[PDB]
Each structure stands twice: as structure tokens, then as C-alpha cells.
Write a protein that binds this ligand. Structure first.
Ligand SMILES: Cc1ncc(C[n+]2csc(CCOP(=O)(O)OP(=O)(O)O)c2C)c(N)n1
Ligand SMILES: Cc1ncc(C[n+]2csc(CCOP(=O)(O)OP(=O)(O)O)c2C)c(N)n1
Ligand SMILES: Cc1ncc(C[n+]2csc(CCOP(=O)(O)OP(=O)(O)O)c2C)c(N)n1
Ligand SMILES: [Ca+2]
Ligand SMILES: [Ca+2]
Ligand SMILES: [Ca+2]
Ligand SMILES: [Ca+2]
Ligand SMILES: [Ca+2]
Ligand SMILES: [Mg+2]
Ligand SMILES: [Mg+2]
Ligand SMILES: [Mg+2]
Ligand SMILES: [Mg+2]
Ligand SMILES: [Mg+2]
Ligand SMILES: [Mg+2]
Lengths: 524, 524, 524
């Protein structure tokens, strides 16, 4: 069989039925005779292609397959790959290369030294040495993306390879299964369990790999047994815990001093599925104050190695959370009391406070809504004001790279047609991947986009305060008409200039059959 | 003095007065106290930032300075860097890094293994080992970008470096001059001149480094003296010769067979400032037929090494073109006859043929117009139908990466306020860097954008023919309203649905004070 | 024709007739049917292979061809490649790779991600995508190594490629010539010449690229015309000037302060063919004192960019030295006074002072001897005490990596059979590449090896003084019998335990027909 036929058979046998792409000449021999059991999702720029695929992979908890055009297409996607690396997203990024005989003369569209292009943002990067072994290289890519710690991989394929005969041993690839579903050996697990049972004032911190593993419910059980407060680790890309559960204590600020203050007094701190820690802002102080032992469970050796404190165990989050939840004793300590309800902020008949927007969303959205956040100055309020009961309910750019949420919201909605996706995106952030809107229109993917328009890069004004930076250019973005941008790409466009309009526009959007963009005038 | 103060002094002393950027926290300590003799040009996404800077650099024939945000911002610009590499654009790309103390824990916005990120698309990539040596690193970056063969470079700077004391010997950097303005030694130059003088039927092929060097007029003199036909090398990123000069024979098709047939019969072919050759489509045949000797003058050792045929000389294009033009004898052969005028294609009262669009542009645009091309199915007709008499009159994505022309047209217009820039961009290509429109509106940069809307990726339909590729998904882009997109970013939007409307809209756009977008309905 | 046949034809047509190698399975399809007009030089370890080839290339002023075994062979040679990079040695390093079909499974002897292995120590590194284009890749490698600035390159070739059919257009590669023989344009050259003519107290500093270009005689004329003192730039890999010419001022110490003190009072300093500057030890101070302008002529853009001071011109050293020597005016100033003769140090009838050894060598060696230095604590004395009148008379590890001189002395002797090579090597340094001795015995290459045995890493004891480092382990190397090592590899072994024995052993060695090693007992 041809490399083309064999490769699509491998993909379908490994569970893949969707190609996210932006096409070019080097990809036509791969895309031709596109099989009837596959679907192609076109996006108009490669940051959008990868963002959509990323959302889809994160929500589906399965690998997503991408096809880009040579160096220029790969290059346009590299900011998106930076986020995918930090979120451990299983992305198989393929890019078409020139014919083997043209690479050395560097014909137009040659991807020069291709394997090096996406580094250091991929787990594995490769250009096969022969056409016949392309299916083997694709198998390697699929498994490298899917094994813990999951992440993006890159495969560059010369376009003349697809019509060649595949290695006739390729069929052994089709049904290979690779497991990383491992947990600490019994002897050492029993020791850890005794340490948790012996703690007088334990605390738990959860990161995004909990939600990726769907270990949320096991973490709820563990927190209830230990009667322990639970925080989400800073710079959170996902939500690993029901945010109105009595044990929940919210998002940790991404500051060294802020976090060691929160942990003080807790004799054992158990961190599960997070780096230790994804700090951000300048906030100097102690990593960990005296009297606290930290134990980290992570799926990623790189995280375990770089932690500045604590013991670590490298294992599967799902398997470890399930084991701990079922082995620890039920403590007779008092169960924590829930955090108080957020205060209502007064809202006059003018521009909307972000607190008003989140309170209104929480009042009106379905209880299984999925939120994406790229409204960078309002994250703390978002976490306080949205009740997110279910797994898979929150996404935020895991490497801080803007241009994630708008396309990712489309991919999430494609993966989860039964759950309403609502992306809350600042006016600045919306531009990075604005053309992704077209894909929602074209494929009638009913994502709701809430644009928080205050005319400025607001979070950068906050950082300017922290960093004592005055006379800084480039912080204001006046003169963008988001309803016109939405019309440009075929998406229904509503406005909300006051609270009454916000309520009406959301009511309408939640009743719509296609995607809807709401431009909200928010306070500066 | 501080690293901040010393670095701005180095930049101004080296002739830099403009920063193209999209800001973030790691860049605030660089951008604060922004000096009064500098200007900042904001763009909304980093492919746009780099495209604008690239157009500015290419048109101004001087380095452009860029400031991006860590890995995510750098990553978003990597497709743009692929084009810049191929066009030898002197781009100084700086990116802010986390504090030195935070890199090791990989805080959010740490650019991990930063120097490797932009490779292989840069000449030089570096992260300084100490704050005090940041000015030295910047000096190295400036000169690496500016020396032949010019190209992009990358410097990653931890944000805590800017407030530190600079090396007190940094002042030696300020006025360093580095020259690569070199040409072949007299003995070997005389040998080359004799070979040209005795050729019976010479031909000349010119590439983009001729236009970069402003060697165009010297090449006209050389062609007139040798009485030689002149072609532009394939996949042309720039125009190196007056396109209605009698010697001019047009753009070479980017095909191996096509080019060897054109050169057949010419005993000596002199290639100046081009790779040998930037082939593209599948078009197998001989590189060079018997009876022809090829001599290449290139500024780039990499080009010289990879040519499949001919002798090469690595030298400055300006210096070599000037020397040759002034040393060769005047041949008594007949001057080549000018190419025939293109035929006027039949045009009814409906959608526009591209030939009609180019004929109308050529009739109406000023003689010193500057064109950019990202209308990928219409390039051959564009070259035939636009009379471009002056240097610096044409730009096309040098690596074939879409998303170049829209932002680059803004940078070119900023560099050349006295020359009307007209970007001819397909409906597909327009989306890659659509947000760049905002920069033209905000800074009132009066670029004209002509969107050729035929609803499809037309060039990919053509490639599908050559590659015999049927049932290919993703080739159509219906449902984009470009007038609404322009309104979204504050750019005046006109329509042209037929020839009368095209004439009217162009007359208006040529009389406008700000940027204008014209959406032209073209034939499928 | 086969890839094998075509590749050997390319090598011979490009002037290569010698393969330096250590063989393995992946190289047998290349080495089989070895052409009768080629010679193979075997060495027993790959650092030795590369060092021998390096000496041969440097002395012959032409590229040398190397064949190593996969990753392990390449890896064993990487210290040698570090020296080759710094000396701009034109080395074509080929390494055999596994068959294409086995690279992806990573069979034993697969060179994984091969092109990245030798980086950053090579100008170009590549693994061809198709067998048919291996001759093209070899052409690229030859020209990349040979173009200014010359340096090592790497090509990894799957072993199944050699028997495949070569691209039948490969014959266009055979006679390609690339010239980098360029110099500054007339206008700017005349400006430089006027600045040199107007200088009141010029100084000249010369580096290794002068000797590589055989520009030595032109630099002598330039110095005589300008009546200027001449230094050799620090950490000198080669000798660019007659060391007893009256202008010669010796080797610059490799310290920042030391060099600015030496240059004080000189209004113009012209540096030719050197980095500015290859400092070594800690010696902080001013790079250049006020009142001194520095102008650097270098063949290497990387050197020009990183200099912390001065103007620079990137051009061919041969072409520029010849041009300047012939254009400058004869100065009316007095010629510099020759340096005084070195003093004779007291020498008893016991162990030899190094000064005694060098004085004796200078008294006895032929005037056209070629010296190599890897006696690290005695370099200053060697430069003061050896009269080297001719080009090509001195080599020292250009990156400071020990293991160079012993093998390189064999390659230099192979390249220059009419000049006696004398390598002066410390007892510590001798061990790094000791097995190279076998190649001298086997091929009867009559190098003389003078081992300076003082039982210690003496230069490191000096650095420990500068760095105030006490209680350092590993500085002594007692108990090595060099006469036994020489016998081990079949090289005649003599001793010199006092001055009379040194005189006798040198007289004998200079009359020998094969290689000779002399173990000299030197003071500690
Ligand atoms: C690709 C990329 N470029 C720039 C930044 C820096 N970024 C940090 S937040 C921010 C402002 C975002 O503004 P907006 O989306 O309007 O939200 P606000 O801060 O106003 O709530 C910027 C530009 C980034 N993180 N990623
Ligand atoms: C970044 C990037 N992605 C994809 C491609 C492949 N590309 C080749 S031409 C083309 C179609 C462009 O369509 P349009 O601009 O409408 O012009 P037309 O071909 O219709 O004239 C595409 C998508 C590319 N070259 N660069
Ligand atoms: C590969 C390598 N390893 C270690 C060193 C460090 N090196 C600097 S000089 C020196 C001592 C060499 O001793 P010897 O050759 O006996 O000469 P001496 O210093 O005694 O004159 C050492 C080990 C080096 N330069 N290169
Ligand atoms: Ca067990
Ligand atoms: Ca905002
Ligand atoms: Ca189109
Ligand atoms: Ca000249
Ligand atoms: Ca010693
Ligand atoms: Mg409305
Ligand atoms: Mg990279
Ligand atoms: Mg000359
Ligand atoms: Mg390496
Ligand atoms: Mg003997
Ligand atoms: Mg003896």
C-alpha cells in the first residue's frame, strides 16, 4: 500500500478522525483523496489552526492531528506551541516539506533544517530518512505526543513520499498501545499514605494535570478524607476542583511570597499535577517557610527536577489520585467551611465592571458551561465569581501567550457539543488570533465570545505599577470595532453597553444556533 | 550608566530611532522612560510587528529594531522570520526574558532555552551571560544583522538587566563601523570582465540583492553595454530592473526545465544577487543545457555553496555591479528588442479579471508607486502588466510565507512617505496578518490595500492540477466581508464589483489622506 | 553512475586525493573499491584523525577530507573540532550513518539527530534527504569548508546511499569554483590608506589568518613602509611574521590590560587576520586607552561583530594585505629597533630549563623548520627564543584544546616533506592524543617529537596562582615513561636528561629517516 493509504489507516486505528489544517502545495499529496471517515477543519492562519486543535485535544483528552505548510506555516504556529508545551497538550504537528531532491538546492518552500525549527517547544521533532518509513515515524509521533508527560511533537514529510510504497511491515504499527498509567510502588505508597494520615493540618494544591487526567473527583474525595483546604496552583491553565466546594480556597497568586504565606502553618502540603510553582510577577520572599514538608506528585520529570523544595514522585496523575483517595483514612477533623460569597459591586447605568459581567454569566450560563479566559486583568475576579462544578470547565493560555482562547474555544466547543463554551477575551487579546472566528462560522460551531472592551492592555498597566515603569509606549488599543470584525468573518455580533443590554445579549446568545460575539463596554 | 541608558545610546549612535513592538511585562523595564528621539510602532500581533519592520528595513535599506514578548511573542513571529531570512532583511529582534533568578524555576513567561527558539531562521541568536554585557551583545546583534549577507538576529534579555550598571567600557561600542563593501580583487575581476567582453551571446539574471543594494542602475548600464537580455530570477522577492526597459525579459518561471530552456544558446550567463535558483513547482529537466557557462555573484556564501552549477564569487552586490558596469566594453551588437505589450483581455460588466485589475493600476498609479504582491495565482500577469521603472517598487514574500504583504506594505509606506504603496493581496492571504490594518489606521500610514476576492485559494487549485491531486479539502474561503474587517480596524473600505467601480475606487483611494482598502470581486 | 563513483570524481576534480580516517561498518560502502589515485591515512582514535587532517590542511592551505564512524567516531573528534573552528581550518568531516530503513528504529550505530551532534563547532552540518543528491551535498560541504572564513563542516551519509544511482546532472558540480578573494572597494580603501599614511605612530597586530593566506610577506612590506612595530595577536595559533625582523615585538600576552598598555601611545592600530582579541587569563582593565583608534581587517563576520572596540572590514586577508602593502606611502619615520637577543639562563649539568631547550633547538634546527607547541607553561619563552623566518613555521591549539600538536605535527610533516617538523609537547599534553604516534611509524612520517617532562601540569600551577586556588587535586602526572610509549607505537625513542644528551639526541633526530621521540627531563 502507499504511504498515504498506510498513514491514514494508522491514524484511524489510533483513534484519529480529524485533521486541523491550513493547506499548501507540499501538503496536497497528503490531503488528496481525503478519506470519507475523516473531517478537515480549516482555519485561516496557523496560530488559529493550532489553537483550535489544542482546545480540542485538551477537552477531548486525546491527541489532535495538525497539518501545516512548511516553515512559514510552522513558524506562524510557534506561539501557539509555546502554550501547548506548558499545558502538556498531545498535539501531532505535521508539516509538508519540499521533494527530497529539492531540499538541498533550497527551492522555495523548503523547510531548512526542519527538525530544529519548533525546538525547544516540542517533545520530539523529526524528518524521516525514507518514504517507506513515514508510517513508522508517524507512529513514533503519535506515541511521543500521547505518553506522559503529554505534549506537542513535530514531523516534517517531503511531499513526494506519500505516493511511494510503504514498508510492508507497517501493519504492526496500527494497533500498538503504550501505557504510562503508573503509580508509586506499594511499599513507598504505604509510607506516603501514613505521612498524609499523620499530618495534623494538611493542605492540597492542584494543577492542570489533574483536570487533564479527569482526576478531579478523586481529588475531591482525597480532600474530604483529609479534611484539607485545596488551592489551585498559580497561573492555572485548567480548573482541577469544584470552585464552590467547601474545601476550595481559590487560585494562588503567582508570587513567591504570596504562596509561602498561604502555606505557612500547614505541616504537609501535597501538590498534585502542578509545577512547583508557576510563579509570574516579581514578589520576592521565602519559597517555603519553616515547619512545612512539601510533597509533589507530577507526571513530568522536568517539573520534579526543577522544584526548589520538597520531595517529588513522577507518576500518572489519574492513577496516583485514585490510589491516594482510596487508601487514606477518613480524618475526624472538622471539614473546612466554604469561602464566603463574593460581594456585589455596585453597577450604575454606564460601562460594565468585570465583576458584573462574571456575576451575570454565573447567574445565566448553564451549570456545565465551559469558560475560556483571556481577559488578563480580571482573572482573580473570574475565579471568585464563576461556580465551575464540573471537570473541563476552564482554560487559560498555559504559557501566558495571547491568541489561545479565541481559537481554543472553537476547538473545545467542537469536542464538547453538549456543553456551552463561553470565551471571555479582552479587547487586546482578541486580535492575536481574530481570524479564528471564521472557522466557527464556516463549521457552525456555536461558541460564545464575550469581548471585554476597555480600550487598553490593562494588565500591562498593573505590571507597570509593580515594575515602577513610567512613560511606556504601546499600552492603548483604541479604535477597534469588534462587531465589525465579527461581521467580517460571518459571526453574529451583539453589543452590551450597559447591564440591561448585557442581560439581553447573553439571553439571546444562549438561545442561538451558531456562534455569537458580544462586545461588552467595560470600565477602564 | 545603566544598561537601559547605555543601550539606547548605542542604538541612536548606530542610527536606530524606531522600535517596532508588541509589549509585555518582560519588556517594560526596557520600554520605560522611552526616549524622546525614538518612536514606537505598535502592532496587535507579532507576525504583524515583524512584517511591518521587514517592509521598513527593506525599503529604507537599513536595519530595523524589533521588541517582542518572550517565547510566545517570538513564536508568533517565526513565520515572518522565515520570509526575512530569505530576503536577507537586517532585523534586530529583541525579546524580553524573565528575571535571571526565575529562569531556572521556569516561572511563567520564561523563554526556555531561548537562543534555540528562532533557529534556524536567524544569523545569530544569544542570551547574555550578564547584565553588564547587554550593550556588547546588542552591538554584536546590530552588526550581525547589518553585515553581508544581511539577515535577522535574535537577542533575549532578562528584564532585571536594564536597571543594572553597564560595563564602563561600553562606550567603545557606540561608533563602531563595520564594512562588508568588498569586491573581487583586480586580477580576477579583470579576468571576469574579459569573459564578459568576449561572450558572443551573454544573458543576465538578477535577484533581490540587486534591489537591496540599489544596484539597479548599474545593472541597467551593464546590460546596455553588453547588449544583453535580462531576466529576474524565479520566486522574485524584489524587482531589480526597470520592467519596460528593452533588455527586460521578465520573471523566470520557478521551474528547472523552464529556466534551462530560456538560457539555452547563451554562452555566458551572469547571475547577480540571486540564489541559483529559487525553483518552486515540480518541473523536472536539466539545470543547464550544454554550451552555457554560468557565473554567479552573490553576497551569501550559503547561496554560492548550494548552486548545482556554475562558478561563484562572494562579494557585495553594490560594489561588484558598479565595478562591472564601469569596466566592460560597449558591445557593437544590436540592443535587444523590447518585449511586446500585453494583450487586453476581454472584460464584461461583471467580475474583474486580474489582467484588467493590473492594466487599470498601471494606467492610474503614479510612476513611483510601490507594489506588494500576495495575490498568489496572478503573479505572472502582475509582472507583465505593471511598469515598474524605479528601484524599490516590488515586494513579495521571500520564503513564500503568507502574511507578509499586508503588514510589510505599512512598513514600506512608513519608510517611503513620498511614494504611494499599493498592496495587491488575495482574499486568502489577507487573513494571515489582518490585524496589521490597525497600525495603518492608528499611525495614519496611507497604504492602499487592493483585496482580490475570488473566494478560493486559487494558486492551490493550480498546484492540485500539477500534482494531480483530487478530493482535497480546505481550498475554499467563502464568507469573508473585507469591508467589515477594514471597518473593524478603522480603515476606510471601498468596493469594486466591476470595472467602472474599480476605476472610481482607485481614483478615490489615490486622493485619500489615510489608508484605504478596496475589495475587488475577481473571477474564480 | 553510482553515488560512490560520482563522489570520488567530485573529490578528485576539487583537488582532494587523501582521506584521513578511522573505519567502521557504516563507512565500508564508501571505502570499498578505494581509488588507486587516493591515499588513506589511518589513525587509531578520531581525535588523532582530525588533528592529523587539521595539520595537513593548515600547512597545505587547502581542504582536508575526513571519514569517521557514526556518532561515536564523531564524538571522539569533537575536542579536535573545537580547535579547527578557531583556526578556520577547512575540514570536510564525513561520518557514516546507518541504512535509511534502520535510522528510525535506532539500530546500533545510528547517529541520532546527526546534524546536531557537531554543533556549534561547524560552519554547516547536514544529512542528505536522498541518496541521489549525496554528490550535491558533498559539493556544498567542500565549498562551505573552503569559502572564507574557512572552517570545519559535517556531512552524515546513510551507508546504503553509496551504491545508489547518482543524479545524472551531478557532473555540473565537478568543476565549480567559488571565490572569496575580495577586498574593500576603491573609495573606502583609499580612505583607509590615507588614515594609515597620516598616522603619527601606527602599530600593526597580526593573527593566524595572515599565515593561512600566505600574506606574511605582504605584511612585512606593509610594516616596513609604515615603519610600524608588529605584534602577534594573543593565543596565537600560527606565526604570521618573521620573528627576528626589526619591526617584530613578539607575542601579545592574552590579557585585556596587558594589551591596552602595549598599544598605548599608538594613534592607529591596524589588526589583520585576528580576532579582537583572543584574551585568556583574568587581567581586567581598558580594552583600549584613549587616543588609540583601532581598525580590524578580518575574514570572519563573527569576529568583526564581537570586537568590543574599533572599526572593522570583512574581506580576504591575502587580497587586503597585498592591496595595502602596495598602496601605502613610505613613511619618513625611523624603522623600529630590533628586539634584543634573549639572555642565556644559567644551566647546570642536571635537568633542563626550557630556555636551554629552545636556545639549543634554535642553534641546531634548520632555518625552515616547522615548530608545533603544546608545552603550555613555556610559550612565551618559545616565541622569544626561536627564530622563525618563513611562513608556515608555527602551530598551537587554536581553541586551547590539548591533543592537537602531536597528531597535527604528523599532518604538517605529511604536507611538507621538505621541511623538518619539530613538535615541542609537554608531558601532560602528550597523553591526550598519544596513539597518533602509530600513524607516524606506519606511514614513516619523519616528525620529531620533543617531550618536555617535568611531571606536572605546570601551566595549571601558574593559573592557580593567578586565581588564588589552593588545595587543588589532579595537577601532577608522575610515572609516565615516554620512551616506552614511543616503543609501544613503533617510534624510535631517545632521552635527554642533561644538555649534552639533548645536543646529541637532537643531532641524531635531525639525521634520522623516520619519526623520533626525545624525552627531555625539564625543571619543575
Ligand atoms: C503573544 C503575546 N504578546 C504580548 C503579551 C503581553 N500581554 C500580557 S497581558 C496583555 C494585555 C491584554 O489586554 P486585554 O486582552 O485587553 O486584557 P486586559 O489586560 O485589558 O484585561 C499583553 C499585551 C503576551 N502575553 N502574549
Ligand atoms: C503561511 C502560509 N500558509 C499557507 C500557504 C500556502 N498558500 C500558497 S498560495 C495559497 C492560496 C492564497 O490564496 P489567495 O491569497 O486568495 O490568492 P489566489 O491564490 O487566490 O490568487 C496558500 C494558502 C503559505 N504559502 N503560507
Ligand atoms: C582537552 C583539554 N583538557 C585540559 C586542559 C587544561 N590544560 C591547560 S594547560 C594544561 C597542563 C598541560 O601540561 P603540560 O603539557 O605538561 O605542559 P606544562 O604546562 O607543564 O608546560 C592543562 C591540563 C586543556 N586545555 N585541554
Ligand atoms: Ca508494588
Ligand atoms: Ca483591555
Ligand atoms: Ca483567492
Ligand atoms: Ca571598487
Ligand atoms: Ca608538564
Ligand atoms: Mg445588539
Ligand atoms: Mg527553533
Ligand atoms: Mg586588488
Ligand atoms: Mg552538539
Ligand atoms: Mg630505531
Ligand atoms: Mg638515548
Amino acid at each position: 500500500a502507499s504511504v498515504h493509504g498506510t498513514t491514514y489507516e494508522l491514524l484511524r486505528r489510533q483513534g484519529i478522525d480529524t485533521v486541523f489544517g491550513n493547506p499548501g502545495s507540499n501538503e496536497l499529496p497528503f490531503l488528496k483523496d481525503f478519506p470519507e471517515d475523516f473531517r478537515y477543519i480549516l482555519a485561516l492562519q496557523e496560530a488559529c489552526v493550532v489553537g483550535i486543535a489544542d482546545g480540542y485535544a485538551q477537552a477531548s483528552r486525546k491527541p489532535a492531528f495538525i497539518n501545516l505548510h512548511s516553515a512559514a506555516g510552522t513558524g506562524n504556529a510557534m506561539g501557539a506551541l509555546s502554550n501547548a508545551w506548558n499545558s502538556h497538550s498531545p498535539l501531532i504537528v505535521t508539516a509538508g516539506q519540499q521533494t527530497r531532491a529539492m531540499i538541498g538546492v533550497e527551492a522555495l518552500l523548503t523547510n531548512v533544517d526542519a527538525a530544529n525549527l519548533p525546538r525547544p517547544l516540542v517533545k520530539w521533532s523529526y524528518e524521516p530518512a525514507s518514504a517507506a518509513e513515514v508510517p513508522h515515524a508517524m507512529s513514533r509521533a503519535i506515541h511521543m505526543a500521547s505518553m506522559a508527560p503529554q505534549g506537542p511533537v513535530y514531523l516534517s514529510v517531503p511531499y513526494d513520499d506519500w505516493d511511494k510504497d510503504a514498508d510492508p511491515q507497517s501493519h504492526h504499527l496500527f494497533d500498538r498501545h503504550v501505557s504510562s498509567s503508573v503509580r508509586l510502588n506499594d511499599q513507598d505508597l504505604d509510607i506516603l499514605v501514613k505521612a498524609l494520615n499523620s499530618a495534623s493540618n494538611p493542605a492540597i494544591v492542584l494543577g492542570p494535570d489533574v483536570d487533564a487526567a479527569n482526576a478531579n473527583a478523586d481529588c475531591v474525595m482525597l480532600a474530604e478524607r483529609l479534611k484539607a483546604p485545596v488551592w489551585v496552583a498559580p497561573s492555572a491553565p485548567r480548573c482541577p476542583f469544584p470552585t464552590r466546594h467547601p474545601c476550595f480556597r481559590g487560585l494562588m497568586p503567582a508570587g513567591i511570597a504570596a504562596i509561602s504565606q498561604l502555606l505557612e502553618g500547614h505541616d504537609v502540603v501535597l501538590v498534585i499535577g502542578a509545577p512547583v510553582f508557576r510563579y509570574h510577577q516579581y514578589d520576592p520572599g521565602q519559597y517555603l517557610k519553616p515547619g512545612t514538608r512539601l510533597i509533589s506528585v507530577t507526571c513530568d520529570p522536568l517539573e520534579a527536577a526543577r522544584a526548589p523544595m520538597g520531595d517529588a514522585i513522577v507518576a500518572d496523575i489519574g492513577a496516583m489520585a485514585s490510589a491516594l483517595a482510596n487508601l487514606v483514612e477518613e480524618s475526624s477533623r472538622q471539614l473546612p467551611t466554604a469561602a464566603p460569597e463574593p460581594a456585589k459591586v455596585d453597577q450604575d447605568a454606564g460601562r460594565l465592571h468585570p465583576e458584573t459581567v462574571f456575576d451575570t454569566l454565573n447567574d445565566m450560563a448553564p451549570e456545565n458551561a465551559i469558560y475560556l479566559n483571556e481577559s488578563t486583568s480580571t482573572t482573580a475576579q473570574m475565579w471568585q465569581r464563576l461556580n465551575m462544578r464540573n471537570p473541563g470547565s476552564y482554560y487559560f493560555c498555559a504559557a501566558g501567550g495571547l491568541g489561545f482562547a479565541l481559537p481554543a474555544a472553537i476547538g473545545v466547543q467542537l469536542a464538547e457539543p453538549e456543553r456551552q463554551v463561553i470565551a471571555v477575551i479582552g479587547d487586546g487579546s482578541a486580535n492575536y488570533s481574530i481570524s479564528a472566528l471564521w472557522t466557527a462560522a464556516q463549521y457552525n460551531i456555536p461558541t460564545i465570545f464575550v469581548i471585554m472592551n476597555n480600550g487598553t492592555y490593562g494588565a500591562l498597566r498593573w505590571f507597570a505599577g509593580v515594575l515602577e515603569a513610567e512613560n511606556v509606549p504601546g499600552l492603548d488599543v483604541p479604535g477597534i470595532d469588534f462587531r465589525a470584525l465579527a461581521k467580517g468573518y460571518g459571526v453574529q455580533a451583539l453589543k452590551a453597553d450597559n447591564l440591561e443590554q448585557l442581560k439581553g445579549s447573553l439571553q439571546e446568545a444562549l438561545s442561538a444556533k451558531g456562534p455569537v460575539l458580544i462586545e461588552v463596554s467595560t470600565v477602564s
